[PDB]
Design a protein around this nucleic acid. Structure first.
Ligand SMILES: [Ca+2]
Ligand SMILES: [Ca+2]
Ligand SMILES: [Ca+2]
Lengths: 161, 161
DNA sequence: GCAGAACGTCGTGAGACAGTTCCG
DNA sequence: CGGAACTGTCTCACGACGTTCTGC
């Protein structure tokens, strides 16, 4: 299993060269809420250091997708979805510092999702947490995320709520 | 006073946003050899995250120097010298992965320095290890450090060897 | 005489997604 | 569908010193 010092290290490395983010994906094919909330954490590194990503991958149960080269000589390792994150984030959270908040927001989103997936009003509250996470990843002088505001208007205009 | 997971986290963070390097500092007022092999590890972070550095600083016995702004919106924390590094690195080496080689090469330099101090020939050998550490911090397609070649030419030309 | 503390910065190595394609 | 896997990349956030100031 993942030992304490391994999780501590990964958390430190994630606080350094990694990212914890959420996004709203337009889904034209979806049926009433034409969006899918995507959740993920990733580690990024110069391609020559790809082996170290592979090592973290193994320690995390081989969950996620490794990419030897994004195309710009950079390599990355991304773990998408509640399935993997529900198991991984709990192991890292006690050690995360810089990105600890973002991690908790993702976990919050994961627990709210089942009942928000087909309920416009609950979906909006969940979208507010998505904006929070995107803003936590922005400098203070950057335009804040406005997914909640935009979807609230969309939902009203469509009668959904 | 550093717990395993505390050291592992720091190691992971350093592997992420830190640096472990060695360099030659020209010393106009030195008496046989006019240079000093300076050693250090540093943590770098966007100014707005300075407080996380202040925390690591405290966890490492408050050794080193904290800069809220290098002058470009970037903050950093630098630990210079064998005195501090001879205590700090041994604690981090067990958990460093990416910069592990650099930490050990610095520890090596620390153990050879006393004798290389006033021995041009030994000083050069030690400088070779400085070049190794600088090379470790380069891509494979970059110019390899020339501290050894340039110092040797200076020493011969100055009749020191 | 010796060395750490500060300062300054070119050259990127990252981040944080946006899109688009793939799969049970 | 419902969601994950793969592609792609704009905008910085770093790095790893070279150089100069301070201290005993
Ligand atoms: Ca970083
Ligand atoms: Ca890095
Ligand atoms: Ca970084």
């Amino acid at each position: 299993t993942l030992q304490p010092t391994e999780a501590a290290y990964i958390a430190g490395f994630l606080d350094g060269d990694g990212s914890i983010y959420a996004k709203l994906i337009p889904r034209p094919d979806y049926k009433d809420i034409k969006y899918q909330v995507s959740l993920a954490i990733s580690f990024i590194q110069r391609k020559d250091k790809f082996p170290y990503l592979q090592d973290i991958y193994d320690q995390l149960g081989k969950r996620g997708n490794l990419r030897k080269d994004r195309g710009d000589g950079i390599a990355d390792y991304t773990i998408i979805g509640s399935t993997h994150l529900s198991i991984i984030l709990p192991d890292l959270v006690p050690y995360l510092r810089i990105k600890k908040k973002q991690a908790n927001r993702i976990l919050h989103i994961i627990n709210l999702y089942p009942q928000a997936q087909k309920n416009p009003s609950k979906f909006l509250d969940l979208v507010k947490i998505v904006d929070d996470v995107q803003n936590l990843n922005k400098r203070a002088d950057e335009l804040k995320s406005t997914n909640y505001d935009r979807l609230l208007e969309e939902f009203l205009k469509a009668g959904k709520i």
